[PDB]
Structure 1
Amino acid sequence: DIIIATKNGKVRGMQLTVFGGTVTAFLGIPYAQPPLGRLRFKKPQSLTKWSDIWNATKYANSCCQNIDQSFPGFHGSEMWNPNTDLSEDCLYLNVWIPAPKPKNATVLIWIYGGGFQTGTSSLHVYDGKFLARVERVIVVSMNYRVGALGFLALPGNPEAPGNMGLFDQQLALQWVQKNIAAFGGNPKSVTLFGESAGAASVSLHLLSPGSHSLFTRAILQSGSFNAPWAVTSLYEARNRTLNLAKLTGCSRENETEIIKCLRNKDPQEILLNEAFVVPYGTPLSVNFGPTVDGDFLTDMPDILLELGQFKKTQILVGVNKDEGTAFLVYGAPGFSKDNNSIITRKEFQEGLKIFFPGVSEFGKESILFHYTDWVDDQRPENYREALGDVVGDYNFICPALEFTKKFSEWGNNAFFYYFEHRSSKLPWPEWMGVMHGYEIEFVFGLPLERRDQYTKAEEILSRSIVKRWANFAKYGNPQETQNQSTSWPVFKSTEQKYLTLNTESTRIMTKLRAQQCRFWTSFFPKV
């Protein structure tokens, strides 16, 4: 029976057996007033406090969200769907601590991705028990609001100010500051890590004055706020809020009246209308996401990045070799997870329409030109691979690299990785390669479980990643020092060294995607 006294009252955890040892799991601790009724669309409000013992022995409700129904029965898509009841009552967090209770352990705080429209902390591939067991760190993860319920913005209006889910994340960091010592944690040694939209969140906490003292350092897996899906302009955000009102029958003259009406809608009516607030979407559409609110974010984030206005600390940043491929089967013509998807030039052309719907003809021809100068054989997979690379380079890899250059130009140490191992168990087909999201199970140490059908080479690779992430969190330096590992150099503009993560041999390389990123970073923005 393990009971911890928190600031707001007692909580009871549960003991788990993990690799011949024990971890204590406190699952579903609340960290804010449930955001219901008059609190829908508002900043999270602080927790009242309880007497008696709160039982943190099961995962809580996931936040309301639309679900992926493109591949019913298929584990490759379905593993990302929520595995707890959906509810507006979802502001809870999880804590995994080593047993015996540690004395002053580093804390790793996970922020899930999902486009800021989806996601939940309770997914199997984010289970923190393995990290707590093996590295003796404490792992924390939180649910935060997503979609319109988390990001609806009528900027400047506190009834719906925008960025509510980012404030949810913030309030959970504050909970760790006030409470984690009771669990044997060091509030002075907190590292945020997150993937995709979770990585873009981590990058925005580096920018938010109110987050600066709530953590020590940051890890960004395939995401950063300068990615083109990551931040909505004030103009598109007001437009979206108003389109949502049109569709739900809540157009009014007074803006506060609009929100009042929106608070009477059932969550379903709101979720059903989210896809249509926009005239054309792509598979990467973020209809309701971070905005410049004058509160969480004081100015356009590209300006803060460029002018050095962010927390000074070390970062670890990385991407997967085939980021863009998972998205091609959610609308590009000629793609299928169930065949080899050899597409024509005409199909490639139509795919650019799917992925770059607002872009001029010239803009799209410039993409085709940069990506279809073949080298040179008449390989049939040319157009299929080019489309995946287009989508991965624009959306993930070039923004990650550019975030990393700009951040390290102000004097701090940065480490960059390129993940290139395809899981032996991936249910998606082979042409999709080393997909977006499929490093996460390596970072959380799932292949450390022998029962679990990963190869030996994969266990060893995961074990080494876990040690490098942990050494980064504790010490600021992602080395694996005992096993003659390749030493991981800092990423500097100029040399731009990065480390490859793979099962065969780990390499130091330079200037990842140099020709492609010159295209996306210096030319495409002008288009």
Structure 2
Amino acid sequence: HSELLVNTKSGKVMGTRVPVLSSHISAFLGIPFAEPPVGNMRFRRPEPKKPWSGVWNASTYPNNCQQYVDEQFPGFSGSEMWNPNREMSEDCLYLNIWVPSPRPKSTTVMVWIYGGGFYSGSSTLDVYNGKYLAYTEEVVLVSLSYRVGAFGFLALHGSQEAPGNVGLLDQRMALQWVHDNIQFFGGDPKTVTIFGESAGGASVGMHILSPGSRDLFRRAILQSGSPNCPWASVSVAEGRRRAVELGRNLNCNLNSDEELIHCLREKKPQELIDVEWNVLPFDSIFRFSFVPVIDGEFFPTSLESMLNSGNFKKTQILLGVNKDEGSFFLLYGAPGFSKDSESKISREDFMSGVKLSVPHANDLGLDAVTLQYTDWMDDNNGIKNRDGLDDIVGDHNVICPLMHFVNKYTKFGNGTYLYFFNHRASNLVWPEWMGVIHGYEIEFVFGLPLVKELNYTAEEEALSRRIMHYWATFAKTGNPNEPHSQESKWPLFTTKEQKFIDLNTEPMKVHQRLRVQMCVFWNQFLPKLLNAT
């Protein structure tokens, strides 16, 4: 059809129409936005995609970037729904677009940036299927791809052959192409919102911060992730260490910075993936090997200064956090946590647990941390030690850093909306001790509760639409709230009162100062203590 044929400045693109609920919308899958980072392009900045001729078959899904595959619970849906579902390849720099039907004139664009510790990811996962959101909200949804792991973050600072943040650029480039072409799919370029979760949420905030990205989007949404998370960046120095340490495992020639790169450039992708985790510098839960580097090019200065002087894009943002963030990481990395078990923790594994969580802390620091989360009226409670550990991981790595980002931001920002998601899906396949898990508000945002066959309750399908509207309304207004709607208002977050809201099946309530006592400890006390040592 004509609906299915579009002309972009890059070339002509033929999509496909796909069913969605009762109607039918059109989708363009796997349009390339950069020259494939294969060969000796490996490790280098993305290169714009030389226009093609003839029509491109954007009817099928693209390959997924090389990465670590979670084989911890083979067959378990809970775990595999995040594993790549398409042939992996180094040629994976494509993007996907879900367009309403009929094609809009020019409407709100939403760009999804997936994330998984910067070592995994994938735009093709079924949980990230645009059709429900695109259709239910009349919106042009586009999800992009980017290089994860060593392929996108290995950083030998001085070299032009392997500077870091490279995978952060694949992002910008996709962001560039969208800006330059989304108008042909009926999307309004002056109104694109980029929203990502976890490492994606941190990436979103890193583009709000970075000069070269700043101009390419309108607003932002960060879900369980701010750019200043302890796990989201490293010095060009640490980056270099891990760069060579990787070479060292792969029997590379660590003599010349040029040779190191050559060697790493000749290894089968999966060989790099095999030793990927052997470079971490300490035993710890929630830290990844290849991550963004604070280089001075993508980031002018340390993130703290930028945050501090207002050196960032000032627009309006909507961000949030989930009830049980740390849950997922403990299960995968702490001793004592088991999937098929209640997982009560000994006061002896709780100690081991704590060490893994604050790996950069000395004794005194660890005590502080314990004195903090330990209940002493009953200090050997299996559950209390388990749940208390979940809070340590969560607060330290996701909540508290975001709260910091939120305060320093709203001091210059043009609007700040904050949610606290805490509804546990009726059909979650993970065990209860895990609660409202990390990354599990995603399925609600993308509207899966809307399909019968996934057995979601009725008030859950209600909440999904409630979320999906907040999210889309914000995206094209800079406010979640309906201009007049007879509903309760999602109040703006102020440094005065600082209200936020509960996202769940029952009637919204607004609260104040989310985890303030616990976060002053993380954001102020602990740091000052480890500093004096």
Short-chain TM bin: over 0.9
Partner of 2:365: 363
Q: 2:433 is matched with which residue?
A: 431
1:273 aligns with 2:275: yes
* 1:479 Cα deviation after fit: 1.3
8 Å CA contact retained: 2:316, 2:413: no
Is 1:226 matched with 2:208? no
Q: Aligned equivalents of 1:246 and 1:463: distance in 2? A: 51
Q: CA deviation at 1:376?
A: 6.6
Q: Residue 476 of structure 1 corresponds to which residue in structure 2?
A: 478
Tell me by how many angstroms 1:374 deviates.
5.3
Deviation string 1:33-65 (CA, Å, 9 cap, x unpaired) is 000112100000011111111111111011000
**Out of 88, 113, 116, which is 1:114 matched to?**
116
Q: Secondary structure of 2:100's match?
A: strand
Separation of aligned partners in 2, 1:285 and 1:379: 28
Give 1:75's match in structure 2, choosing from 56, 74, 77.
77
One of 16, 32, 51 as aligned partner of 2:53: 51
2:384 is aligned to 382
Secondary structure of the equivalent of 2:162? coil
Output the amino acid matched with 2:207: H
Task: Name the counterpart of 1:512.
Answer: 514
Q: Which residue of structure 1 lines up, in the alignment, with residue 496 of structure 2?
A: 494
* Correspondence list, 1:319-330, <5 A: 319-330=321-332
Conservation of the 8 A alpha-carbon contact between 2:375 and 2:384: no
Per-residue CA deviations over 1:80-124 (Å, capped at 9, x if unaligned) read 100011110000000000000000111000000100000101111
Displacement of 1:492 after TM fit? 1.1
Cα offset, 1:318, TM superposition: 0.2
The 1:485–1:140 alpha-carbon spacing in structure 2 relative to 1, beyond 3 Å, is: same
Following superposition, the deviation at residue 375 of structure 1 comes to 7.2
Alpha-carbon distance in structure 2 between the residues aligned to 1:14 and 1:283: 43
Cα distance in 1, alignment partners of residues 348 and 453 from structure 2: 47
Asked whether the 8 Å contact 1:93–1:172 carries over to 2, the reply is yes
Secondary structure of 2:158 counterpart: coil
Q: Partners in 2 of 1:483 and 1:445 — Cα distance?
A: 22
Q: 1:21 maps to what in 2?
A: 23
Are the aligned partners of 2:248 and 2:254 in contact in 1 as well (CA < 8 Å)?
Answer: no
The DSSP-based 3-state class of the residue aligned with 1:509 is strand
**Cα distance in 2, alignment partners of residues 205 and 140 from structure 1:** 17
Give yes or no for contact 2:277–2:288 (8 Å, CA) kept in 1. Answer: no
> Cα–Cα, structure 1 residues 133 and 482, in superposed 2: closer, same or farther, change >3 Å?
farther
Equivalent position of 2:142 in the other structure:
140
Q: Is the 8 A contact 1:43 1:164 kept in 2?
A: yes
Cα pair 2:357 2:392 within 8 Å, conserved: no
Q: How many angstroms does 1:331 deviate by?
A: 2.3
**Cα distance in 2 for residues equivalent to 1:333 and 1:44:** 40
Once the two structures are overlaid, the 10-residue window that deviates more, 79-88 or 292-301, is 292-301
Residue 173 of structure 1 aligns to a residue in which SS?
A: helix
For structure 2, the 5+ residue unaligned runs are: none
Residue 343 of structure 2: aligned partner: 341
1:235: which partner in 2?
A: 237
Q: Alpha-carbon deviation of 1:328?
A: 1.0
AA aligned opposite 1:332: A
**What is the CA deviation profile of residues 345-397 of structure 1, one whole-angstrom value per residue up to 9, with x for unaligned ones?**
11111111222334212111111100113577986411111000000000001
Q: Name the aligned partner's letter for residue 102 of structure 2.
A: P
Shift of 1:293: 2.1
Alignment correspondent of 2:91: 89
Match of 1:300 in 2: 302
Looking at structure 1, the residues matched to 376 and 25 of structure 2 have their Cα atoms a distance apart, in angstroms, of 53
Q: Indicate the residue corresponding to 1:417 in structure 2.
A: 419
1:261 and 1:379 map into 2 onto residues whose CA distance is 52
Aligned residue for 1:196?
198
- Mapping of 1:279-290 within 5 angstroms? 279-290=281-292
Shift of 1:8: 1.5
Q: Could you report, residue by residue, the CA deviation over 1:321-357 in whole angstroms, capped at 9, with x for unpaired residues? A: 1011011111212111111111121111111122233
* CA displacement at 1:227 relative to structure 2: 1.0
Per mean C-alpha deviation after superposition, the further-off stretch among 369-378 and 50-59 is 369-378
1:257 to 253, 256, 259: 259
Deviation per residue, 1:281-311 (Å, 9 max, x gap): 4331211011112222221112111111000
In the alignment, the residues of structure 2 paired with residue 35 and residue 201 of structure 1 have an alpha-carbon distance, to the nearest angstrom, of 20
Equivalent-residue separation in structure 2 for 1:98 and 1:61 (angstroms): 24
State which drifts further: 421-430 or 293-302.
293-302
Residue from 442, 445, 449 that aligns with 1:447 = 449
Bigger Cα displacement from structure 2, 374-383 vs 364-373:
374-383
More moved, 271-280 vs 36-45: 271-280
Letter in 2 for 1:498: F
Partner of 2:334: 332
C-alpha spacing 1:386/1:185, structure 2 compared with 1 (3 Å): same
Residue identity (%): 53
Amino acid at match of 2:33: Y
Contact 1:467 1:480 survives alignment (8 Å): no
CA displacement, residues 390-444 of structure 1 (integer Å, 9 cap, x when unaligned): 0000000111111111100114210100001001111101111100000001111
- Which residue in 2 is equivalent to 1:101? 103
Of 130, 133, 137 in structure 2, the residue corresponding to residue 131 of structure 1 is 133
Please report how far the alpha carbon of residue 480 of structure 1 lies from its aligned counterpart in structure 2 after TM superposition: 4.4
Partner Cα distance (2:36, 2:442) in 1: 29
The SS at the match of 1:381 is: helix
Aligned-CA RMSD value:
1.4
Give the partner amino acid of 1:177: H
The answer to which of 471-480 and 98-107 deviates more is 471-480
> Over residues 8-42 of structure 1, what are the superposed CA-to-partner deviations in whole Å (9 max), with x where a residue is unaligned?
11111110121222211111111100001121000
The alignment's TM-score, normalised by the length of structure 2, stands at 0.96
Please tell me the residue identity of whatever aligns with 1:89.
Answer: D
Preserved contact between residue 82 and residue 123 of structure 1 (Cα < 8 Å): yes
Distance 1:281 1:52, change over 3 A: farther
| Cα separation, 1, equivalents of 2:253 and 2:492 | 53
Query: What one-letter code is carried by the residue in structure 1 that aligns with 2:339?
Result: K
Distance 1:375-1:309 versus aligned 2 partners, 3 A rule: farther
Quick one: distance in 1 between partners of 2:266 and 2:212? 31
Could you say if the C-alpha distance between residues 359 and 312 of structure 1 is closer, same or farther in structure 2, counting changes exceeding 3 Å?
same
Matched residues in 2 for 1:173 and 1:503: separation?
34
